[PDB]
């Protein structure tokens, strides 16, 4: 079972870094062919996903084709555009080109840092929201404030102040409020971009159907179906009806859930457990597919045009490896960092 024994100070240190690695973020290329994984140590790996899914595939094809140090602190969030890869690291966002990150140069385009309260902590950036219909980017983190940045020029337009503690996740549903934000304070807030005000607040811990005071009050994940909402984290995995703010159904699971998303007609979830949780919208546990990590922090559906062969579900968390699901009942393989 111990196949590779390191036998050397550098290789023992590399085995210790791989053993203590956490993969926070995932991003996909504009084509389906590449994957990007953010690191505990501020590194970024680039995964040739089409080469991994090919018929000709080697054991060294499940390795980063380009990995590079990109931030001083951990990479908590990535997002991708038509041409760029935006990565939020220590307290600032860097931008990378997909054409140049495969080459030997690996230079950055810009480096933008939002204005702060000048406290001596240099707060994090937990969630990156890429807004269509206008070239914009929403920053959220330990400043407890939502910053809006233009993508063309590095100017910060709106600052939104509704939360008490820091923010974990953002959302988008293309209507009049159009922006959800959930945080450590325990309330999902709605942020109309035109008036730059808060229009609705849903406190999930106040409702006794959802409370669970043992884990605490923190909202880790949000999801939108433009009429519905899935809110999870500390309290419970709950299905809310927007414009009513009523808890419709509860998903009966013990472990706290760090990420949630809408599938075609399923609910995908992952958290402190080992497995990926597939729910039905009524509230019935359809499946639990075991992964290779003891806990998961990120899911990604690679639903991109011009590459139908790169249509997989990728999962990552408290490990140095990424589980790739070519089908939703079993893992096909795993990409080492």
């Amino acid at each position: 079972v111990p196949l590779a024994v390191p036998l050397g100070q550098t290789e023992v240190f590399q085995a210790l870094q791989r053993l203590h690695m956490t993969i926070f973020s995932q991003s996909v290329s504009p084509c389906g062919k590449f994957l990007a994984a953010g690191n505990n140590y501020g590194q970024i790996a680039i995964f040739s996903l089409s080469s991994a899914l090919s018929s000709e595939a080697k054991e060294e094809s499940k390795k980063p084709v380009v990995t590079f140090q990109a931030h001083d602190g951990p990479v908590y969030s990535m997002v991708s555009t038509d041409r760029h890869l935006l990565s939020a690291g220590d307290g600032e966002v860097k931008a990378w080109l997909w054409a140049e990150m495969l080459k030997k140069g690996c230079k950055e385009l810009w480096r933008r840092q939002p204005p702060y309260r000048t406290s001596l902590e240099v707060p994090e950036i937990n969630a990156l929201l890429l807004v269509p219909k206008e070239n914009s980017l929403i920053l959220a983190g330990g400043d407890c404030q939502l910053h809006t940045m233009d993508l063309e020029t590095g100017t910060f337009t709106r600052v939104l102040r509704g939360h008490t503690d820091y923010i974990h996740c953002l959302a988008l549903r293309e209507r009049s409020p159009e922006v959800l934000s959930g945080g450590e304070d325990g309330a999902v807030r709605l942020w109309d971009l035109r008036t730059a005000k808060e229009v609705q607040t849903i406190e999930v811990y106040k409702h006794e159907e959802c409370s669970r005071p043992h884990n605490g009050r923190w909202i880790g994940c949000l999801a939108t179906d433009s009429d519905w909402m899935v809110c999870g984290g500390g309290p419970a995995l709950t299905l809310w009806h927007l414009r009513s703010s009523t808890p419709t159904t509860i998903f009966p699971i013990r472990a706290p859930q760090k990420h949630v998303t809408f599938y075609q007609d399923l609910i995908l979830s992952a958290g402190q457990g080992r497995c990926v949780n597939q729910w039905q919208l009524s509230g019935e546990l359809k499946a639990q597919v075991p992964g290779s990590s003891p806990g998961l922090l990120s899911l990604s559906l690679n639903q991109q045009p011009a590459a139908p062969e790169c249509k997989v579900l990728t999962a990552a968390g408290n490990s140095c490896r990424v589980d790739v699901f070519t089908n939703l009942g079993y893992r096909a393989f795993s990409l080492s960092f």
């Binding site: 079972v1 111990p2 196949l3 590779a4 024994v5 390191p6 036998l7 050397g8 100070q9 023992v12 085995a15 210790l16 870094q17 791989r18 053993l19 203590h20 956490t22 926070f24 951990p74 908590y76 902590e121 707060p123 994090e124 937990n126 330990g142 820091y166 974990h168 450590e184 605490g216 923190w218 880790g220 760090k258 402190q272 003891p294 806990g295 922090l297 408290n318």
Partner: protein, 383 residues
């Protein structure tokens, strides 16, 4: 001389085997060149030098001449090496003996630190002391062992590079640089084992021996203390439920020393399994943590346990001090005591009052607790 022997040693060294003669010449040259704290001698009888279990005994035939070199270190202690030769196998081996000037009152958990079976086992990374280097001897023994290893000595690779044997005829140029590098490695190894002996003698009394130099690494007040430090066995290490990752990574080999530390606060017990490989102060000990405080908070169901393991294992170079950095294990244990204090005080609800000046309790997606210490202002930040 009271107000020579080299000629008698040359008349004795006339009868040595060629790898033993090359070792004698290079050892005298290195002793006269740089390090005068070295002495060599030849032990044997010149009359024998002039010249199916019986086949096994005559195959494992020791040459009657052997060489014996001893080093003294700056700890009033000496290391004795005796090199033996096997003319039927073309392999030379070594027996070792560490002796100090004092009585050397040993503790219980010291054990295999200075036990002469496994002192010099992994000078270079690996080499195991077990297997024969050249495969021609493996084919010869296949035509016809560890008890004979304990009886005769260990056939390492560095010993045979000292003799001049090149295994893919003795050479002085092959012995030249390898001589100085291996003597420096022996001088570090013996000092490291004596320092670990002193540290274990202190750690069995529940006291973590910290030096006057390392005091800036830690805060002043500490509440958590070490109550048990007991060496365990390999199989006992692999029977533990919370150490599967070390074994599956390939770090829990046979040639390691396995320890159990137990650190407590009020109804809070923390079991820390420790792996040392014999290249200490160059490769750090690896820790695994299991907190039996409420239920069983282990590495698989908690992320702050994994954060403390990352603060101890991966960031170990912050804890190494000067160039003779043999104080690394005590610095890791003291930091892990500090991390247990932080994990118990900064947990949100109250059996443990929070006296830390952290100024922010959680950050990041994993809701991380502050585990980095800042000395000139004295406060805890996040990593």
């Amino acid at each position: 001389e009271y107000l020579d022997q080299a000629h008698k040693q040359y008349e004795t060294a006339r009868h040595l085997p060629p790898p033993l003669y090359v070792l004698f010449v290079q050892a005298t040259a290195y002793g006269q060149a740089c390090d005068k704290t070295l002495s060599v001698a030849i032990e044997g009888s010149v009359d024998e030098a002039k010249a199916l279990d019986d086949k096994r005994k005559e195959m494992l035939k020791r040459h009657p001449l052997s060489v014996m070199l001893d080093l003294k270190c700056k700890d009033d202690s000496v290391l004795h090496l005796t090199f033996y030769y096997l003319m039927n196998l073309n392999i030379m081996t070594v027996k070792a003996k560490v002796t100090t000037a004092m009585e050397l009152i040993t503790p219980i958990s010291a054990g295999d630190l200075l036990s002469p079976d496994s002192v010099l086992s992994c000078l270079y990374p690996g080499d195991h002391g077990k297997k024969t280097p050249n495969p021609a001897n493996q084919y010869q023994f296949d035509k016809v062992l560890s008890d004979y290893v304990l009886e005769l000595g260990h056939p390492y690779l560095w010993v045979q590079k000292l003799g001049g044997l090149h295994f893919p005829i003795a050479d002085h140029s092959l012995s030249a640089s390898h001589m100085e590098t291996t003597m420096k490695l022996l001088k570090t190894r013996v000092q490291s084992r004596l320092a670990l002996h002193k540290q274990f003698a202190s750690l069995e009394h529940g006291i973590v021996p910290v030096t006057s130099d390392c005091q800036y690494l830690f805060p002043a007040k500490v509440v958590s203390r070490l109550v048990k430090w007991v060496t365990v066995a390999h199989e006992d290490y692999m029977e533990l439920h919370f150490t599967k990752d070390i074994v599956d990574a390939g770090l829990a080999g046979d040639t390691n020393l396995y320890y159990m530390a137990l650190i407590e606060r009020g109804t809070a017990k923390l079991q820390a399994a420790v792996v040392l490989n014999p290249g200490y102060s160059s490769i750090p000990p690896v820790f695994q943590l299991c907190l039996n405080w409420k239920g069983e908070k282990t590495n698989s169901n908690d992320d702050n346990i994994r954060a403390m393991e990352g603060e101890v294992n991966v960031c170990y170079k912050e804890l190494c001090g000067p160039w003779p950095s043999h104080q690394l294990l005590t610095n890791q244990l003291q930091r892990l005591c500090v991390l247990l204090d932080v994990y118990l005080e900064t947990e949100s609800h109250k059996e443990f009052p929070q006296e830390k000046m952290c100024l922010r309790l959680f950050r990041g997606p994993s809701r991380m607790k502050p585990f980095k210490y800042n000395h000139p202002q004295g406060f805890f930040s996040h990593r």
